[PDB]
Amino acid sequence: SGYSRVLLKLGGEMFGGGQVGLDPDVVAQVARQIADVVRGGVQIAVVIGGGNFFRGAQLQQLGMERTRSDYMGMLGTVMNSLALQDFLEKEGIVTRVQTAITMGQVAEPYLPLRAVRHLEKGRVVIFGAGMGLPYFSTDTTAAQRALEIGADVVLMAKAVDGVFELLTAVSHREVLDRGLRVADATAFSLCMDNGMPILVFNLLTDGNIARAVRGEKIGTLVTT
Amino acid sequence: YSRVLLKLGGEMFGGGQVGLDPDVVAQVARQIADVVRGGVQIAVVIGGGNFFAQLQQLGMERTRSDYMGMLGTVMNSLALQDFLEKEGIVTRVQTAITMGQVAEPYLPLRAVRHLEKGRVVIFGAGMGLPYFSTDTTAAQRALEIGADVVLMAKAVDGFAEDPEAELLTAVSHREVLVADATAFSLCMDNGMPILVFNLLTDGNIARAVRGEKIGTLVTT
Amino acid sequence: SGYSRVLLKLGGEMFGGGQVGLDPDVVAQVARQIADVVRGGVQIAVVIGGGNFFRGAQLQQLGMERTRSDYMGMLGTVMNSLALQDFLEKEGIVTRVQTAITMGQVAEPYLPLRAVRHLEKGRVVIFGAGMGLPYFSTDTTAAQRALEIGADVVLMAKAVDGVFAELLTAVSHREVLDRGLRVADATAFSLCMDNGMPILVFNLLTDGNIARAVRGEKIGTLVTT
Amino acid sequence: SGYSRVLLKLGGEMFGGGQVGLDPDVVAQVARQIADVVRGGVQIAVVIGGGNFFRGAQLQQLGMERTRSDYMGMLGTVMNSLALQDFLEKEGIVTRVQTAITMGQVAEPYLPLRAVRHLEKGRVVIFGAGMGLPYFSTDTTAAQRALEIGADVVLMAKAVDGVFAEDPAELLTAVSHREVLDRGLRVADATAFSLCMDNGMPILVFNLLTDGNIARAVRGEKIGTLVTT
């Protein structure tokens, strides 16, 4: 009734918590959350964002080149990746980082077949640096990664209960017809065209992933 | 000085607070342009302290912590690269950590070609090995590209003991032994001059390169 | 008066002639037609398609896993990259293939900075394998690649003279949405519209066209801002 | 009499069905037949051909450069690898593709010691891209790969009952490597066959499109043409 494997997307504020940089109090809670869901037998893969450092869109409006900016952003996601990797291991969770941009000793490259084979071994795969291409967003990276590793659903982890009065379950068509926010613009088209459910839920409420991954009606569940 | 390697701490990008201060980076890029226009070969080594120590205080593995700094120096390096091109300067970034899609790898021979070509080389990722500091990277890179001096660019500008009064200017390596331990011994053992100075005062970088009596000159 | 560097998108049509495999007569007049743009002094980069082999989306309708199908498709575009490379070298054109999927022994990996140098050196960069990610098309490749090497326009090389109303000489990105015209892919178009990349749809099998569009002549359909 | 581990050579035939491209009614039949051997405890390695896309030799006589054309042909074999991986996964079989042209993101490279380990683990190892070398053929990749992973026999999978005499004639049951040379028989390319003969590698030519043969062949039954020295 619930989800077997899932792809968790964590914006940059899930590691900064509204400020800039790393905020170990938030990162530690996130790992606690993911730590329990992994012990429950679920297969969790994580797409880290870079909002707490740079967003190439905000840097080109600043005058900077979009491409330099976009790459600065991705490297930021590789730092958050390592940070999440570190706390997860202090929780007793085996993690594996794979970066879109081939880095050397830092992390392993994007081997999508192996990434799925880590999940079947009960490991946490952390996809860093997004897709490694300027002019794309983390959200779109969560979709492509969720589609390719065969996750049962994408978990848009926000710091807010859901989609707004709140909603308990909508369609992909209704999100566009209603102009509803949350879930990226490009990412949502890629999910809808492929029948990838999106579950927007509050991650900072202690114990939501355990429940959301459990299948309980929480947050907003975009389907079909 | 023929070719110079400029060492910049991470705070030379974040100006006090965390993150980037585009006002600080713009001043640095503006002053580096004047040195390049003066006919000097400049290589820059970037620090990554402006993205956080707090990494050792919270208990991170030493390896992962150092790679977060090396990643940081790449972001500051790409940032400087952007403001240098608005200043009309041609630059090339070489990273010690092979990234390919983001910048070329570190090759000291190639790096020399660039400088001879009038373009600026920006050294990132420090040294692609944990357990090293940025001063050791700046010093170790300067020896490798044959630089004539290492420009330790501080927020001060050159003392006695202050940790109260009184500066200094020009001392011996043997009489010193600030400069970071492994970074200083690596210079002394190879006779590398080190010039500590304040770059955030408009026009000093142009002064130091010509050889004016500014800052502190550390010679053999 | 025209375009400095350009990004040409060649569907699998240009390689199989509408059928499976290679039509070595078609790729040739493509090569010959691309060399005239290069000798004219313009920098050109090409995004190779894989229609003449497999489309990852048409293989799942048939029963196969979508992901493997997509990789078969991206592998196909590499084979076309090599085909186009050969017919271009006999045109006296120095080419450089860059595959999204890292291969090393077959071609370079995608090094976009280095790719821009190749153009500046007068070479033809061939971006094979799409973007090396399943669930993305080559139309989206062409767009993303055009923006990253800073191309001036995406050349959608169709076998027809352009985009009609059932010949449009110039339309806007928003005008195509409100008219729901033929376009050149949904995602690829939104990526070009949102970033202000012009899209010129034109027939390159008609001798001289690519040279005329690159020189700035009013040919085909220009989609701007 | 039963073969412990086998190296099966699948030419482009078994993927295009004689025409260009992918004939899924053919691959599905092939996958169904391999799976029957796997479920019998046999260790199977597969060398995937590329006839259904390009042959470097046939493209050079067409004008293209032989080297550049060979990579086109090797890449094709990787496409067939991913195909056979799919239909073999629908039968329940666990597969592992190893390509001589290192393509990290699409499949692990050629690591023969590991590959033998998969076999030991009951997985099917699919070898794509032949040997990753212009001026070589998939037959030679069967020979070399059979020799290296320690396979007991090279199963040349055809669509004909076996190796005939005179090339239509009668069907031969068992011959020696030197006899194949003395009689003018085309068993599997000269470069590949020489590599087998020089190293005492048995060759068994048989029709696997006939439902059940590969199970009889591995079982040690007198099917097809067995070439031994």
Place this chain on the structure above:
Amino acid sequence: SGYSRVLLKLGGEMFGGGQVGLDPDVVAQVARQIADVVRGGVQIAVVIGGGNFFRGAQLQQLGMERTRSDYMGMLGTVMNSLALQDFLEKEGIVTRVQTAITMGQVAEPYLPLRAVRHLEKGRVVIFGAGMGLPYFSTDTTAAQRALEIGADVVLMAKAVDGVFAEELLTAVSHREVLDRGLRVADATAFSLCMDNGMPILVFNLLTDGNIARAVRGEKIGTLVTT
């Protein structure tokens, strides 16, 4: 008018002379004459043998598993390759080594498009580890490597100048070698060259300046053509 691009095959005995190991007196003489070739405007790529250490077949006959023995042999070739690279750089010659068995730190892998690009840039490519495949010999690697970089001929550098009868042959056909069965080339490697029209020139390189003489087009050694 001679040969523009050449592929020079060096057996393990062009490194160890008498028996096993390295003899810097021989390897220097090889690097000396390779350098005259590069200085003369010719494009050279070298395929290194490893007989001076381990001979794949000769180890399995000893009791060892053949596959291991071929890698042991291939590894030796990488050793020789690193040794020649060094002497060729005391001579002022720029070299790049590519190993068929990927090793990263030791030398870039086999990238055949760079291997040609290096040649076009006037540097010498050293192919080591053979073809990284057991059950193959370096003589075969010389042929395959010569075909993929488009070399004009293979130069089999022997310690005795030419192909005899039991009488030095100055010109024979690929077909004539078999109809005669004439000692040197190697069965597999000879077929691969023959079938593709790859001329093989057996010659002695331990002689004043032969490789230079051969590359210039002079009639030295045994030339085997289509």
Place this chain on the structure above:
Amino acid sequence: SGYSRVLLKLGGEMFGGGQVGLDPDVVAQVARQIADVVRGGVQIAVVIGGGNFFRGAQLGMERTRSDYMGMLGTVMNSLALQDFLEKEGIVTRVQTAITMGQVAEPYLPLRAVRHLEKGRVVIFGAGMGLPYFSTDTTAAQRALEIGADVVLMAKAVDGVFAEDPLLTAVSHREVLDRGLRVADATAFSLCMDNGMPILVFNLLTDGNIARAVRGEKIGTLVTT
């Protein structure tokens, strides 16, 4: 009361017999001797040297290229021992510090232990994959890596004396004081600072490894 796991260091002489190349009579006697330890339930890791190829002490070549030639030689000796060890019925796993994949798995000290705990013999070749390192330093390093109980400096002539004309136990402080040049400078300082016992013993005398592992009073045990 013996040793659980042990790191046997083999000089190049243990494959060449004293001259260049491989002498299969000696390589067999070593493999036959290692078998006696494995059958005794002991966990053995071996570090191989490459002095029997670039024979002598002539390191014209740059030191960098020179070191890699040596390290390559070690891999070749590694494969040799692996082969004769399997003729003994001893399952082995070779790990090289220079990543080769096609030739042998890389060096993962965690992975290596598991090979030891599964009753397999791990052979560490290629020294430490870096120049400016010797085989002795590698042995000491690897013995610390995998938590060995002692390093077994296998000599061809047992005997640590006081004066060139026997000892039986000594101290790390005394070796430095008595002029004895056991093992190697860096390697010895790496062992003394980490309390790694060193046992210099004659490997070629049938039965010495088995009784030295068991804990008999044979050889010169350099204890902490």
